[PDB]
């Protein structure tokens, strides 16, 4: 949801580590 | 007890190409090619374009009677012609250096249309009501809105010499015409003088015109011809028209304001109340991608056009679920 | 791949590891499960982000470019204009496509390398306290609890503290 | 008992370059650069080219008497000039917009040469047998096969006005000339009118010509000059010639059909009964390779020209026997 | 090379292995000879075919391109046409030569890595049932007949069936 | 006892970029981008450039009186105009095909200025003393050094016809002018023929000029105009001037010798006693690097211009002290 | 890097090794110190020299190229000349910058590979006469003095000469 | 001769494995 | 100083091995 494991400003890892 | 080293796999069906292999299914990828437009003509940074509609550049600047709605326009971000922009020169002839004039207008951001030679006071010894059925308006014969067909008055066409001093602080685009009758009887009837001449001079322009009388094939039911000329009057400079026949005099001229990034495009799309930074003849683009395959013709700040159908960069791993 | 890990001696990927590009699977008597290597994944994300940003920034904005008009006696100039437009379009299409292809190859090799290096550092830590079982897996010659697994993941595996126990069980 | 892992080696002497190393001998490689041609002019997909031989485009379209073999030609795939293509304009003067006419012919696949103004019937009040020694044929004075030198008849040159309506359903290339004598005695002897003019008009063409009499340096022993003009008549349009002197009238014109992929090249090679998809001025190419270093001028479907002397891609291993 | 196998720890190539880019040499009591690895050679051939075909397909067909003519007062336009032609020729010559160079380097490294990965696969199969004698060769601590060799080749080597014999021979 | 494998580290702060990482500090690197010039105009392989100074190409070739120090120059390596090269046409008018003449001069390495029509012996029946205040020299009215203003002598301007045969074995650049007075009275007072004409012919050049009388806005206190023309006379060919008024005759002409690698640049830099192989408008480059970011305009053998601010190749290792 | 040596399992460089890109550190009772590998450094210098010269020679030389002039009625031709100049400049700027970036990445990986291969060759020579203590260092199970160290560097390490001594000390 | 060990439609492996 | 350990015609190794 609102929290991401990674800093990915360009969307390079899609929904990986996204919560 | 065990420990293993591994890599990610997911449900992605994205495929990329490499040099050794095609259609590698990968976990993550990014599209670098923009292929979506809105299908609309839009304002460019808040400024609406000038839509010529049925008219082209020539009908606009000459004042073709079919283009009266375009007379009060003053500023624009780009110029749009359509596949039906055919109302240009209505009395047949040649528009001299027309393509160069379009290229000049491609860098004009605004102008002031103003009366350079008022109809009622500039030609007291000549008739000013000359019209034609080639440039009809609402059924009746008419004429260009920015020009004036000077004719004989009371059987005489005196030598005329009229001047204008550019006090606008801007370049002034001045257009005029030269009429070539089909036979010498029409020449004498319209201008009385058979060895007529026109002379147009500025500080850096200098041309003389001679009527060429001959019968031409009928175009828009006219055997005569009319050639259209233009020049740029520099600020503070003077233009002088001298004639004893065949001059299609200027009535309105344009004080031009130059800008950057404008142009003329041909488009079948329709104007919406949208804003954009990138306009193509097919529609506006709203994208941060480096490439697009929508159209080579671009206005504003656009991605680079390419012929590619797919530019997909792999960012994740080979996907092996 | 070049480094033989992805689609190589590690034959498949893990759909159960949802939080990282690379990581581990643990199996002790406290249970089993996946552990994403978040720092290697983050450094890979940084590198790939720089790569995509590089492609985007080398392709600076395309300002107003429209067609030109020519009269009927300017066919040579018209054909020169379209030769120019078409040549530039050929070159830019070629550049874009082959840049994407070559960088895709390099990216796949980059991930392959990261997995191979992760495997090698785990092996370097474990030494003879564990046996190689193929498919990227190790089998400990001793008991390794969850904190011991995290020790392996963070690079702080204590080889002496299990050396004796594991050379007993190794026989 | 042993098992070893190794790699291939052979007798190959192929060498490639890398960025780190030059002249690496490799087991297998493939050439990407075509350097072989057949040295012949060939048909393009079964259609033979037009060989102008000793004539150039001008001599061919005007009907230079040295180019009579070229008159019945009707279709071609490309046009070949030679370094000896010198027979063009025989009577000295200027071929106006000649390069544009060549560019026009570069997209013409076929045409019909036809009589636009028959000699024995279009000019009853003028003489049509004017010849000159500048356009010799078999030793005798002669003239262009497609044009007609109109001169005074029985001491008078009446005003002529002749027209032609294009019913060919195709563009028609019409060529004419304007004669400028060296002195006014020749002007009067030939055209019996000292203030002569020519007027050529269509629906979109409109020009007038005036003789410029003066003595020039002798070119091919002619102190007079002759300027050559051309226009494209649109389907259904009419061309009108009006004159009272100095008109080199059209006799034959060309109804043109447009095509793609053609062009004009200069070549020293000779025609053979070969068929190709790629023709260069040095010879034909039959190749599936992506690059060639034979010639930058190409007709058909050819590899990309580059200046490289070698483009060899390694496919196998470094060769270490 | 980047992977240190070709011209590296495997010093030379085999002219006696005429059937494949990579393969094996065996020497047991049944005799000696070469065995090309046909699957790896075919995979490499597919990859290199894709590479060459990519270079060819990215260079689209060059359609009719002929010179133009200009009169004596069109020297500026003539020189502009010349500048355009020569700039495009410069760019395409550069692109062709550089693409060939970089792809040649990549291809040599590709073959190097294939050989290295083959060697490591055999090593992972053999484990301690054989010794590394250098130059890419292994020496079995046991008897390995031609079907044992072929099982090394197709990746089905039976470690437990020779473990006992070889640890007694290894002593 | 231990042995370790390691790599170099040093005190370097050189940084390079890669595709995966920016600002990588490395032990060794090399710059490929030249950004240093000497700020001077230098000689090109020993041969000094032609410095026009206050004059432009037109003032130089016509012989503007402000450009007298340029009269004896004979050879050069390139041509330098400055932002103040304003002295060109002093009597207002149009220099016809001026840009083409500049392009022609861009391939001239030397010439011989020679008297084609000596003043005291080529025009016995005309006055040759015409000067103007528009072309002032040291306060007094003057005229071009290479042209001659022919005017009536003792109330008559007889028809003149003069010729020159090119015996130089080289192309000869001939320049002339045509005067267009502001009114009929000046035309009569100067040339005493109201229907004047000029004819200039060679074997491949053919033009006639007629005066256009009209009042123009004052440029340099002149209401008349003067158009300037030029042609290249081929070796062995003859040029003929015929007139009965309004001819600004040639007096000096230029026998041109062609060369490779020259050009015309605009630059603000100063000339030094300095030799280079590469000259830009900002200064000379002495470099074997492949790229430069100094100026796109180059003369000689120069590195390739790019917009880059930095092109640094790493040659050593990532630096980790 | 792709090969995991530089900034990898060898965490830093050696400021004390000033005479070569790659090399060794020795520590026996005769003393301590660095020894640059001059032949591998020279090979690397040859390769990188070829690379730099390849860039330089592919760029050729830019001969005379000046602006042109156009009158007030030649605006279309003027803008076409500008379009040609700007397009060529765009393409060459892009080519230069991208080539430099790509070759920089390849150069760093080339050096990483060289260090990794040096390490692996020393390991291949030592076998079980020494232990891997991480950080790219080996620890001998025997006495190895300065000429034994040079024997390791030059590729002439005599394994049987210290076999038994080191198996005794390995226990 | 007429039989090849590999599918090599571009000639990338030359005469290797060809009988 | 005057002696170099390496042949480095383009100067790609700087002052390394230079004495
Ligand atoms: C496909 O999987 C996604 C989960 O995200 C994927 O897996 C990640 C590890 C990473 O690889 C991403 O790039 C992938 O897109 C499913 O979407 C998620 O579903 C959960 C349900 O628990 C929901 O909470 C999330 O919001 C979803 N995420 C997104 C981005 O929408 C998706 O349903 C799967 N699709 C199919 C068809 O199976
Ligand atoms: C060079 O060797 C070839 C054999 O083929 C070579 O080896 C292959 C493994 C592969 O690397 C190819 O690309 C190489 O060209 C000789 O040619 C063949 O010889 C065999 C002998 O049994 C014969 O049966 C074949 O018909 C031959 N085929 C061809 C295409 O030549 C060739 O003679 C050798 N040349 C010299 C000069 O020694
Ligand atoms: C930085 O160090 C250099 C020494 O050279 C460095 O190390 C080499 C191994 C190689 O990596 C080079 O590229 C490096 O630049 C110093 O330059 C030398 O300084 C000493 C001082 O004792 C002097 O005697 C030498 O003559 C210098 N070298 C030369 C070729 O003249 C330099 O001084 C150092 N800089 C700083 C700020 O400390
Ligand atoms: C492979 O990709 C191409 C285009 O890149 C596509 O035409 C084709 O259908 C794909 N093949 C498969 C099996 O998806
Ligand atoms: C582009 O899309 C973004 C996201 O919806 C929006 O905020 C922005 O206004 C859009 N730009 C234009 C020009 O419409
Ligand atoms: C392992 O690394 C983590 C990362 O911060 C740290 O919290 C932990 O203390 C380290 N040691 C162990 C034994 O987990
Ligand atoms: C090395 O290759 C170049 C061109 O690649 C060639 O000119 C030269 O002769 C070759 N030298 C040797 C020794 O093969
Ligand atoms: C080895 O591989 C071949 C090929 O598939 C197969 O026929 C054979 O059964 C496998 N096993 C052995 C022991 O050879
Ligand atoms: C990183 O590099 C960019 C250009 O490559 C430069 O502008 C910037 O200052 C650098 N930043 C640091 C922290 O070195
Ligand atoms: C090691 O190699 C060098 C290389 O020249 C040689 O001089 C030396 O004799 C070799 N042996 C030893 C023990 O150093
Ligand atoms: Ca027009
Ligand atoms: Ca001509
Ligand atoms: Ca001019």
PDB file of N, CA and C in Angstrom, chain F residues 28-96:
ATOM      1  N   UNK F  28      43.320   6.280 -13.180  1.00  0.00           N
ATOM      2  CA  UNK F  28      43.849   6.871 -14.397  1.00  0.00           C
ATOM      3  C   UNK F  28      42.721   7.058 -15.399  1.00  0.00           C
ATOM      4  N   UNK F  29      42.823   8.131 -16.175  1.00  0.00           N
ATOM      5  CA  UNK F  29      41.835   8.446 -17.199  1.00  0.00           C
ATOM      6  C   UNK F  29      42.481   9.385 -18.205  1.00  0.00           C
ATOM      7  N   UNK F  30      41.824   9.541 -19.350  1.00  0.00           N
ATOM      8  CA  UNK F  30      42.305  10.431 -20.397  1.00  0.00           C
ATOM      9  C   UNK F  30      41.151  11.282 -20.909  1.00  0.00           C
ATOM     10  N   UNK F  31      41.443  12.561 -21.122  1.00  0.00           N
ATOM     11  CA  UNK F  31      40.489  13.496 -21.696  1.00  0.00           C
ATOM     12  C   UNK F  31      40.496  13.364 -23.214  1.00  0.00           C
ATOM     13  N   UNK F  32      39.307  13.264 -23.809  1.00  0.00           N
ATOM     14  CA  UNK F  32      39.162  13.227 -25.261  1.00  0.00           C
ATOM     15  C   UNK F  32      38.562  14.503 -25.833  1.00  0.00           C
ATOM     16  N   UNK F  33      38.206  15.468 -24.991  1.00  0.00           N
ATOM     17  CA  UNK F  33      37.507  16.676 -25.415  1.00  0.00           C
ATOM     18  C   UNK F  33      38.441  17.872 -25.292  1.00  0.00           C
ATOM     19  N   UNK F  34      38.760  18.495 -26.425  1.00  0.00           N
ATOM     20  CA  UNK F  34      39.620  19.671 -26.431  1.00  0.00           C
ATOM     21  C   UNK F  34      38.785  20.914 -26.148  1.00  0.00           C
ATOM     22  N   UNK F  35      39.169  21.669 -25.117  1.00  0.00           N
ATOM     23  CA  UNK F  35      38.456  22.885 -24.745  1.00  0.00           C
ATOM     24  C   UNK F  35      39.362  24.108 -24.693  1.00  0.00           C
ATOM     25  N   UNK F  36      40.603  23.997 -25.156  1.00  0.00           N
ATOM     26  CA  UNK F  36      41.570  25.082 -25.073  1.00  0.00           C
ATOM     27  C   UNK F  36      41.937  25.555 -26.473  1.00  0.00           C
ATOM     28  N   UNK F  37      41.874  26.866 -26.682  1.00  0.00           N
ATOM     29  CA  UNK F  37      42.364  27.507 -27.890  1.00  0.00           C
ATOM     30  C   UNK F  37      43.305  28.631 -27.478  1.00  0.00           C
ATOM     31  N   UNK F  38      44.015  29.193 -28.454  1.00  0.00           N
ATOM     32  CA  UNK F  38      45.010  30.215 -28.158  1.00  0.00           C
ATOM     33  C   UNK F  38      44.457  31.632 -28.237  1.00  0.00           C
ATOM     34  N   UNK F  39      43.182  31.794 -28.589  1.00  0.00           N
ATOM     35  CA  UNK F  39      42.567  33.105 -28.669  1.00  0.00           C
ATOM     36  C   UNK F  39      43.021  33.972 -29.820  1.00  0.00           C
ATOM     37  N   UNK F  40      43.808  33.437 -30.751  1.00  0.00           N
ATOM     38  CA  UNK F  40      44.394  34.229 -31.821  1.00  0.00           C
ATOM     39  C   UNK F  40      43.983  33.701 -33.190  1.00  0.00           C
ATOM     40  N   UNK F  41      43.950  34.604 -34.167  1.00  0.00           N
ATOM     41  CA  UNK F  41      43.988  34.218 -35.564  1.00  0.00           C
ATOM     42  C   UNK F  41      45.431  33.894 -35.918  1.00  0.00           C
ATOM     43  N   UNK F  42      45.663  32.738 -36.500  1.00  0.00           N
ATOM     44  CA  UNK F  42      47.016  32.369 -36.885  1.00  0.00           C
ATOM     45  C   UNK F  42      47.063  32.068 -38.366  1.00  0.00           C
ATOM     46  N   UNK F  43      48.276  31.884 -38.888  1.00  0.00           N
ATOM     47  CA  UNK F  43      48.431  31.436 -40.256  1.00  0.00           C
ATOM     48  C   UNK F  43      48.005  29.978 -40.369  1.00  0.00           C
ATOM     49  N   UNK F  44      47.621  29.581 -41.576  1.00  0.00           N
ATOM     50  CA  UNK F  44      47.196  28.212 -41.852  1.00  0.00           C
ATOM     51  C   UNK F  44      48.266  27.556 -42.715  1.00  0.00           C
ATOM     52  N   UNK F  45      49.069  26.692 -42.092  1.00  0.00           N
ATOM     53  CA  UNK F  45      50.186  26.023 -42.757  1.00  0.00           C
ATOM     54  C   UNK F  45      51.131  27.041 -43.393  1.00  0.00           C
ATOM     55  N   UNK F  46      51.384  28.132 -42.671  1.00  0.00           N
ATOM     56  CA  UNK F  46      52.336  29.135 -43.093  1.00  0.00           C
ATOM     57  C   UNK F  46      51.764  30.308 -43.863  1.00  0.00           C
ATOM     58  N   UNK F  47      50.514  30.234 -44.312  1.00  0.00           N
ATOM     59  CA  UNK F  47      49.926  31.250 -45.180  1.00  0.00           C
ATOM     60  C   UNK F  47      48.915  32.059 -44.380  1.00  0.00           C
ATOM     61  N   UNK F  48      49.079  33.380 -44.396  1.00  0.00           N
ATOM     62  CA  UNK F  48      48.265  34.258 -43.576  1.00  0.00           C
ATOM     63  C   UNK F  48      46.859  34.397 -44.159  1.00  0.00           C
ATOM     64  N   UNK F  49      45.864  34.660 -43.319  1.00  0.00           N
ATOM     65  CA  UNK F  49      44.510  34.887 -43.824  1.00  0.00           C
ATOM     66  C   UNK F  49      44.360  36.298 -44.373  1.00  0.00           C
ATOM     67  N   UNK F  50      43.267  36.498 -45.098  1.00  0.00           N
ATOM     68  CA  UNK F  50      42.900  37.820 -45.586  1.00  0.00           C
ATOM     69  C   UNK F  50      41.973  38.472 -44.569  1.00  0.00           C
ATOM     70  N   UNK F  51      42.412  39.588 -44.001  1.00  0.00           N
ATOM     71  CA  UNK F  51      41.644  40.315 -43.000  1.00  0.00           C
ATOM     72  C   UNK F  51      40.958  41.492 -43.681  1.00  0.00           C
ATOM     73  N   UNK F  52      39.636  41.409 -43.810  1.00  0.00           N
ATOM     74  CA  UNK F  52      38.876  42.472 -44.449  1.00  0.00           C
ATOM     75  C   UNK F  52      38.658  43.674 -43.536  1.00  0.00           C
ATOM     76  N   UNK F  53      38.721  43.486 -42.220  1.00  0.00           N
ATOM     77  CA  UNK F  53      38.612  44.610 -41.300  1.00  0.00           C
ATOM     78  C   UNK F  53      37.248  45.274 -41.377  1.00  0.00           C
ATOM     79  N   UNK F  54      37.249  46.589 -41.618  1.00  0.00           N
ATOM     80  CA  UNK F  54      36.018  47.365 -41.739  1.00  0.00           C
ATOM     81  C   UNK F  54      35.206  47.020 -42.982  1.00  0.00           C
ATOM     82  N   UNK F  55      35.765  46.263 -43.915  1.00  0.00           N
ATOM     83  CA  UNK F  55      35.125  45.973 -45.188  1.00  0.00           C
ATOM     84  C   UNK F  55      34.545  44.566 -45.207  1.00  0.00           C
ATOM     85  N   UNK F  56      33.514  44.376 -46.027  1.00  0.00           N
ATOM     86  CA  UNK F  56      32.991  43.048 -46.312  1.00  0.00           C
ATOM     87  C   UNK F  56      33.376  42.659 -47.738  1.00  0.00           C
ATOM     88  N   UNK F  57      32.948  41.458 -48.143  1.00  0.00           N
ATOM     89  CA  UNK F  57      33.316  40.916 -49.452  1.00  0.00           C
ATOM     90  C   UNK F  57      32.970  41.899 -50.566  1.00  0.00           C
ATOM     91  N   UNK F  58      31.793  42.523 -50.476  1.00  0.00           N
ATOM     92  CA  UNK F  58      31.339  43.438 -51.520  1.00  0.00           C
ATOM     93  C   UNK F  58      32.248  44.657 -51.627  1.00  0.00           C
ATOM     94  N   UNK F  59      32.538  45.301 -50.493  1.00  0.00           N
ATOM     95  CA  UNK F  59      33.434  46.445 -50.516  1.00  0.00           C
ATOM     96  C   UNK F  59      34.819  46.093 -51.016  1.00  0.00           C
ATOM     97  N   UNK F  60      35.258  44.861 -50.763  1.00  0.00           N
ATOM     98  CA  UNK F  60      36.573  44.425 -51.214  1.00  0.00           C
ATOM     99  C   UNK F  60      36.600  44.240 -52.728  1.00  0.00           C
ATOM    100  N   UNK F  61      35.625  43.510 -53.275  1.00  0.00           N
ATOM    101  CA  UNK F  61      35.657  43.209 -54.704  1.00  0.00           C
ATOM    102  C   UNK F  61      35.275  44.407 -55.568  1.00  0.00           C
ATOM    103  N   UNK F  62      34.374  45.271 -55.097  1.00  0.00           N
ATOM    104  CA  UNK F  62      34.032  46.448 -55.888  1.00  0.00           C
ATOM    105  C   UNK F  62      35.091  47.534 -55.787  1.00  0.00           C
ATOM    106  N   UNK F  63      35.862  47.541 -54.705  1.00  0.00           N
ATOM    107  CA  UNK F  63      36.840  48.582 -54.485  1.00  0.00           C
ATOM    108  C   UNK F  63      36.244  49.785 -53.784  1.00  0.00           C
ATOM    109  N   UNK F  64      35.490  49.541 -52.718  1.00  0.00           N
ATOM    110  CA  UNK F  64      35.023  50.620 -51.863  1.00  0.00           C
ATOM    111  C   UNK F  64      36.217  51.466 -51.422  1.00  0.00           C
ATOM    112  N   UNK F  65      36.121  52.799 -51.475  1.00  0.00           N
ATOM    113  CA  UNK F  65      37.288  53.637 -51.148  1.00  0.00           C
ATOM    114  C   UNK F  65      37.821  53.445 -49.740  1.00  0.00           C
ATOM    115  N   UNK F  66      37.005  52.965 -48.803  1.00  0.00           N
ATOM    116  CA  UNK F  66      37.495  52.673 -47.461  1.00  0.00           C
ATOM    117  C   UNK F  66      38.347  51.414 -47.408  1.00  0.00           C
ATOM    118  N   UNK F  67      38.433  50.667 -48.507  1.00  0.00           N
ATOM    119  CA  UNK F  67      39.115  49.379 -48.526  1.00  0.00           C
ATOM    120  C   UNK F  67      40.361  49.399 -49.400  1.00  0.00           C
ATOM    121  N   UNK F  68      40.918  50.581 -49.654  1.00  0.00           N
ATOM    122  CA  UNK F  68      42.116  50.683 -50.484  1.00  0.00           C
ATOM    123  C   UNK F  68      43.288  49.813 -50.026  1.00  0.00           C
ATOM    124  N   UNK F  69      43.572  49.631 -48.729  1.00  0.00           N
ATOM    125  CA  UNK F  69      44.703  48.756 -48.359  1.00  0.00           C
ATOM    126  C   UNK F  69      44.542  47.310 -48.807  1.00  0.00           C
ATOM    127  N   UNK F  70      43.336  46.883 -49.182  1.00  0.00           N
ATOM    128  CA  UNK F  70      43.142  45.519 -49.660  1.00  0.00           C
ATOM    129  C   UNK F  70      43.424  45.359 -51.147  1.00  0.00           C
ATOM    130  N   UNK F  71      43.675  46.448 -51.871  1.00  0.00           N
ATOM    131  CA  UNK F  71      43.875  46.335 -53.314  1.00  0.00           C
ATOM    132  C   UNK F  71      45.079  45.482 -53.711  1.00  0.00           C
ATOM    133  N   UNK F  72      46.238  45.543 -53.042  1.00  0.00           N
ATOM    134  CA  UNK F  72      47.383  44.750 -53.512  1.00  0.00           C
ATOM    135  C   UNK F  72      47.412  43.298 -53.050  1.00  0.00           C
ATOM    136  N   UNK F  73      46.501  42.853 -52.177  1.00  0.00           N
ATOM    137  CA  UNK F  73      46.580  41.486 -51.667  1.00  0.00           C
ATOM    138  C   UNK F  73      46.344  40.504 -52.806  1.00  0.00           C
ATOM    139  N   UNK F  74      47.074  39.389 -52.786  1.00  0.00           N
ATOM    140  CA  UNK F  74      47.001  38.457 -53.903  1.00  0.00           C
ATOM    141  C   UNK F  74      46.697  37.026 -53.479  1.00  0.00           C
ATOM    142  N   UNK F  75      47.143  36.592 -52.300  1.00  0.00           N
ATOM    143  CA  UNK F  75      46.864  35.233 -51.852  1.00  0.00           C
ATOM    144  C   UNK F  75      46.567  35.220 -50.359  1.00  0.00           C
ATOM    145  N   UNK F  76      45.905  34.149 -49.924  1.00  0.00           N
ATOM    146  CA  UNK F  76      45.453  34.009 -48.545  1.00  0.00           C
ATOM    147  C   UNK F  76      45.078  32.554 -48.301  1.00  0.00           C
ATOM    148  N   UNK F  77      44.912  32.216 -47.023  1.00  0.00           N
ATOM    149  CA  UNK F  77      44.526  30.870 -46.613  1.00  0.00           C
ATOM    150  C   UNK F  77      43.067  30.768 -46.201  1.00  0.00           C
ATOM    151  N   UNK F  78      42.518  31.829 -45.617  1.00  0.00           N
ATOM    152  CA  UNK F  78      41.089  31.955 -45.366  1.00  0.00           C
ATOM    153  C   UNK F  78      40.783  33.442 -45.273  1.00  0.00           C
ATOM    154  N   UNK F  79      39.494  33.769 -45.228  1.00  0.00           N
ATOM    155  CA  UNK F  79      39.038  35.154 -45.238  1.00  0.00           C
ATOM    156  C   UNK F  79      38.321  35.434 -43.926  1.00  0.00           C
ATOM    157  N   UNK F  80      38.666  36.552 -43.290  1.00  0.00           N
ATOM    158  CA  UNK F  80      38.115  36.926 -41.993  1.00  0.00           C
ATOM    159  C   UNK F  80      37.338  38.223 -42.154  1.00  0.00           C
ATOM    160  N   UNK F  81      36.042  38.170 -41.868  1.00  0.00           N
ATOM    161  CA  UNK F  81      35.236  39.355 -41.632  1.00  0.00           C
ATOM    162  C   UNK F  81      35.070  39.540 -40.129  1.00  0.00           C
ATOM    163  N   UNK F  82      34.806  40.769 -39.722  1.00  0.00           N
ATOM    164  CA  UNK F  82      34.574  41.093 -38.326  1.00  0.00           C
ATOM    165  C   UNK F  82      33.131  41.533 -38.124  1.00  0.00           C
ATOM    166  N   UNK F  83      32.678  41.652 -36.871  1.00  0.00           N
ATOM    167  CA  UNK F  83      31.341  42.220 -36.633  1.00  0.00           C
ATOM    168  C   UNK F  83      31.173  43.647 -37.140  1.00  0.00           C
ATOM    169  N   UNK F  84      32.255  44.342 -37.492  1.00  0.00           N
ATOM    170  CA  UNK F  84      32.175  45.706 -38.009  1.00  0.00           C
ATOM    171  C   UNK F  84      32.504  45.791 -39.495  1.00  0.00           C
ATOM    172  N   UNK F  85      32.445  44.669 -40.212  1.00  0.00           N
ATOM    173  CA  UNK F  85      32.669  44.675 -41.657  1.00  0.00           C
ATOM    174  C   UNK F  85      31.415  45.236 -42.325  1.00  0.00           C
ATOM    175  N   UNK F  86      31.282  46.563 -42.252  1.00  0.00           N
ATOM    176  CA  UNK F  86      30.095  47.264 -42.725  1.00  0.00           C
ATOM    177  C   UNK F  86      30.291  47.994 -44.044  1.00  0.00           C
ATOM    178  N   UNK F  87      31.530  48.271 -44.442  1.00  0.00           N
ATOM    179  CA  UNK F  87      31.794  49.023 -45.668  1.00  0.00           C
ATOM    180  C   UNK F  87      31.746  48.061 -46.846  1.00  0.00           C
ATOM    181  N   UNK F  88      30.619  48.053 -47.548  1.00  0.00           N
ATOM    182  CA  UNK F  88      30.474  47.239 -48.737  1.00  0.00           C
ATOM    183  C   UNK F  88      29.948  48.050 -49.902  1.00  0.00           C
ATOM    184  N   UNK F  89      28.632  48.015 -50.084  1.00  0.00           N
ATOM    185  CA  UNK F  89      27.952  48.817 -51.094  1.00  0.00           C
ATOM    186  C   UNK F  89      27.819  50.233 -50.544  1.00  0.00           C
ATOM    187  N   UNK F  90      28.504  51.195 -51.164  1.00  0.00           N
ATOM    188  CA  UNK F  90      28.352  52.565 -50.677  1.00  0.00           C
ATOM    189  C   UNK F  90      27.245  53.316 -51.414  1.00  0.00           C
ATOM    190  N   UNK F  91      27.076  53.089 -52.715  1.00  0.00           N
ATOM    191  CA  UNK F  91      25.926  53.638 -53.422  1.00  0.00           C
ATOM    192  C   UNK F  91      24.784  52.633 -53.360  1.00  0.00           C
ATOM    193  N   UNK F  92      23.634  52.990 -52.787  1.00  0.00           N
ATOM    194  CA  UNK F  92      22.639  51.975 -52.420  1.00  0.00           C
ATOM    195  C   UNK F  92      22.087  51.219 -53.620  1.00  0.00           C
ATOM    196  N   UNK F  93      21.750  49.957 -53.378  1.00  0.00           N
ATOM    197  CA  UNK F  93      21.186  49.122 -54.419  1.00  0.00           C
ATOM    198  C   UNK F  93      21.221  47.666 -54.005  1.00  0.00           C
ATOM    199  N   UNK F  94      21.183  46.791 -55.005  1.00  0.00           N
ATOM    200  CA  UNK F  94      21.175  45.351 -54.787  1.00  0.00           C
ATOM    201  C   UNK F  94      22.400  44.732 -55.443  1.00  0.00           C
ATOM    202  N   UNK F  95      23.169  43.983 -54.656  1.00  0.00           N
ATOM    203  CA  UNK F  95      24.231  43.125 -55.171  1.00  0.00           C
ATOM    204  C   UNK F  95      23.593  41.788 -55.541  1.00  0.00           C
ATOM    205  N   UNK F  96      23.432  41.538 -56.837  1.00  0.00           N
ATOM    206  CA  UNK F  96      22.683  40.375 -57.310  1.00  0.00           C
ATOM    207  C   UNK F  96      23.540  39.119 -57.160  1.00  0.00           C
TER     208      UNK F  96
END
